[PDB]
Structure 1
Amino acid sequence: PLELTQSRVQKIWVPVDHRPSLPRSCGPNSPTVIVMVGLPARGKTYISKKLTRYLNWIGVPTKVFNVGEYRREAVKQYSSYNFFRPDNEEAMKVRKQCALAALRDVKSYLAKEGGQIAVFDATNTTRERRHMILHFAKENDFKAFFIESVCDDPTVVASNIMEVKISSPDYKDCNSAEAMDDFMKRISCYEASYQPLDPDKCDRDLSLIKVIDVGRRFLVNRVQDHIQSRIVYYLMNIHVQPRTIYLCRHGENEHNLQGRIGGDSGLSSRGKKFASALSKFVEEQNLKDLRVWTSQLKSTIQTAEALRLPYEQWKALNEIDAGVCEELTYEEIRDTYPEEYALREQDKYYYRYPTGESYQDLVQRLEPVIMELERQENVLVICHQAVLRCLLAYFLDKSAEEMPYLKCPLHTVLKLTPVAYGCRVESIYLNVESVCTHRERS
């Protein structure tokens, strides 16, 4: 009666499954199609890629289906905006076939591949196209959530999104000025038939968000569930202003010298030298209003103390909890807990230390850190190896499987700069020796 067993890897209590003579599998919430809406150069691909990066990182399987990519596959080389003319009978047919092909892949992804969210990245500017997408969702038992981006021409031009748009393989054999001229003519092709979302009348029953003038205003209609509410919250926190994110670990500590994990030890003499070298590096960057964040552990706070700048301590930035393995060396873990050591090496992301955490737990703890990092401008985060791997996996779009093996050395600053649809990463080693704490996969 109420007999449970603790799963070996994740440490989850589950009922003892004394399967009968013929074990049976019950193989395998409703998936959602996010429908992007709007004229070209309205940041729909930027939104698609950002939302997908956030949703995968929090653990919701998401994939983007870009109709232009299907088009590039079906039509060898792009010559001009003439392909997008509303009187181009042949190209109109090809473009519709590409949208139907992408939708066939959306169905396979959500109904058969274990996908939870499909982002349908296309203009979807007419009521006819959107009615067709709603029919596809209704017949497959998928929810539909529309994200429209509306922006006037001067704001689009000032935003510099068209420089990202003309970097497409469509403009491989073009100079910047002619690609820009062609893209402008392409936008004009969509203007006459564009029917914006109308929540007052025709679209009153649809779940949607209109992002107006690069986030200056939002219209939200019929939020149905938690993921729609969360997406709205995420869209209100992100921004396109230029800034820099700096990520580093605390300076080398006394536990690092002994090869000991966790704990709350202080900086070693080298760790103190790195903290000084970090202050000099920060001064040389000459940043406007740098925000500095640390964990609540001693080594990060001593590192921030050398900067002579205000800083905020976050408990969410504390290093992964090793539970019963806290303050042990990896050799002491292998000898005292050999089964635990082998299970972690085999499933490092999902493995939970006894009475401790997994990288999967770290992601959940770190989500408010990520949300606040999106809102901020210049930020320096002084943290710890496993925490840093998690944050870096979010910015660099790394999977759960690669996250626990990302290289984050001591005394090295990782400088992140927002470029196109992601981050440029520059590594800056501050020339202070330390031990190596990186352990490659077995």
Structure 2
Amino acid sequence: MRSIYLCRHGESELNLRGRIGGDSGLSARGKQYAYALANFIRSQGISSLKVWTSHMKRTIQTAEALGVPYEQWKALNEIDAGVCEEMTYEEIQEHYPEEFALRDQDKYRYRYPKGESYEDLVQRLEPVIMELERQENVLVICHQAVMRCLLAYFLDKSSDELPYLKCPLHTVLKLTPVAYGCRVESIYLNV
């Protein structure tokens, strides 16, 4: 049976600082996760695994530790926060108080100044989903907002639930599409 493995890049430097977006590299234990992922994947004994990543350094660097070849997709790049790129939440509240308030109102269609909305994100992920459907075993190393969009599709979630789906770091979600829907398994790689 085919299984789709979904996970995020290992812990980035900006993740450690509590800052959003950007294009930073993996931290120390972020790299230890890349190694732990390589171990888990091997132990899965998956037949002909296709591996996808984004153009962002953090995803690429995580895939490198696997040894096997992978492919890069621009459409898998993290959601653009626009002007709020690399800010902490406190900084967004202080410098864009009205914008921050509008988000909680409708997290699905809200756009930061010159940024993307979850709706924009779902649109550019359409082709990524179409390919995913016509594949067998695949591992997608992406980002939190991207993972939420892909996960919503497979676990059949609404536009309301989507922006709030649980997608923590160092955790792999093994989704097995079945006739009644989709089975899920969560594997936490403690590093």
State the TM-score, normalized to the length of structure 2. 0.99
Find the partner of 1:399 among 132, 152, 158. 158
Q: Residues 129-184 of structure 1, C-alpha deviation per residue, up to 9 Å, x if partnerless?
A: xxxxxxxxxxxxxxxxxxxxxxxxxxxxxxxxxxxxxxxxxxxxxxxxxxxxxxxx
Determine the structure 1 residue equivalent to 2:102: 343
Find the partner of 2:112 among 353, 360, 374. 353
| Counterpart amino acid of residue 368 in structure 1 | P
Determine the structure 1 residue equivalent to 2:46: 287
Find the partner of 1:374 among 128, 133, 138. 133
Aligned-partner SS, 1:398: coil
Q: Residues 84-120 of structure 1, C-alpha deviation per residue, up to 9 Å, x if partnerless?
A: xxxxxxxxxxxxxxxxxxxxxxxxxxxxxxxxxxxxx
8 Å contact from structure 2 (residues 13, 24) kept in 1:
yes
Determine the structure 2 residue equivalent to 1:273: 32
Aligned-partner SS, 1:414: strand
1:242-257 map, 5 Å = 242-257=1-16
Q: Residues 178-227 of structure 1, C-alpha deviation per residue, up to 9 Å, x if partnerless?
A: xxxxxxxxxxxxxxxxxxxxxxxxxxxxxxxxxxxxxxxxxxxxxxxxxx
| 1:306 and 2:65 matched | yes
1:117-196 map, 5 Å = none
In 1, the alpha carbon distance for the partners of 2:180 and 2:154 equals: 11
| 1:264 and 2:32 matched | no
Determine the structure 2 residue equivalent to 1:408: 167
Give the drift of 1:294.
0.3
Aligned CA RMSD, in angstroms, stands at 0.6
Q: Residues 326-360 of structure 1, C-alpha deviation per residue, up to 9 Å, x if partnerless?
A: 01111110010000111111110110111110000
1:189-228 map, 5 Å = none
In 1, the alpha carbon distance for the partners of 2:112 and 2:77 equals: 16
8 Å contact from structure 2 (residues 154, 177) kept in 1:
no
Determine the structure 2 residue equivalent to 1:422: 181
In 2, the alpha carbon distance for the partners of 1:264 and 1:326 equals: 10
In 1, the alpha carbon distance for the partners of 2:18 and 2:177 equals: 35
Give the drift of 1:421.
2.6
In 2, the alpha carbon distance for the partners of 1:340 and 1:259 equals: 19
In 2, the alpha carbon distance for the partners of 1:421 and 1:366 equals: 24
Aligned-partner SS, 1:373: helix
| Counterpart amino acid of residue 307 in structure 1 | L
8 Å contact from structure 2 (residues 144, 167) kept in 1:
yes
Determine the structure 2 residue equivalent to 1:238: none
| Counterpart amino acid of residue 177 in structure 2 | P
In 1, the alpha carbon distance for the partners of 2:63 and 2:105 equals: 36
Q: Residues 292-314 of structure 1, C-alpha deviation per residue, up to 9 Å, x if partnerless?
A: 00010000000000000110010
Q: Residues 379-400 of structure 1, C-alpha deviation per residue, up to 9 Å, x if partnerless?
A: 0000000000000000000000
- Structure 2 unaligned residues grouped into runs of 5+: none
Q: Residues 35-91 of structure 1, C-alpha deviation per residue, up to 9 Å, x if partnerless?
A: xxxxxxxxxxxxxxxxxxxxxxxxxxxxxxxxxxxxxxxxxxxxxxxxxxxxxxxxx
In 1, the alpha carbon distance for the partners of 2:157 and 2:13 equals: 31
Which protein is bigger by CA-based radius of gyration?
1
| Counterpart amino acid of residue 257 in structure 1 | L
Q: Residues 214-254 of structure 1, C-alpha deviation per residue, up to 9 Å, x if partnerless?
A: xxxxxxxxxxxxxxxxxxxxxxxxxxxx2110000000000
Determine the structure 2 residue equivalent to 1:167: none
In 2, the alpha carbon distance for the partners of 1:420 and 1:314 equals: 29
In 2, the alpha carbon distance for the partners of 1:259 and 1:340 equals: 19
State the TM-score, normalized to the length of structure 1. 0.43
Q: Percent identity?
A: 81
Give the drift of 1:275.
0.4
| Counterpart amino acid of residue 275 in structure 1 | A
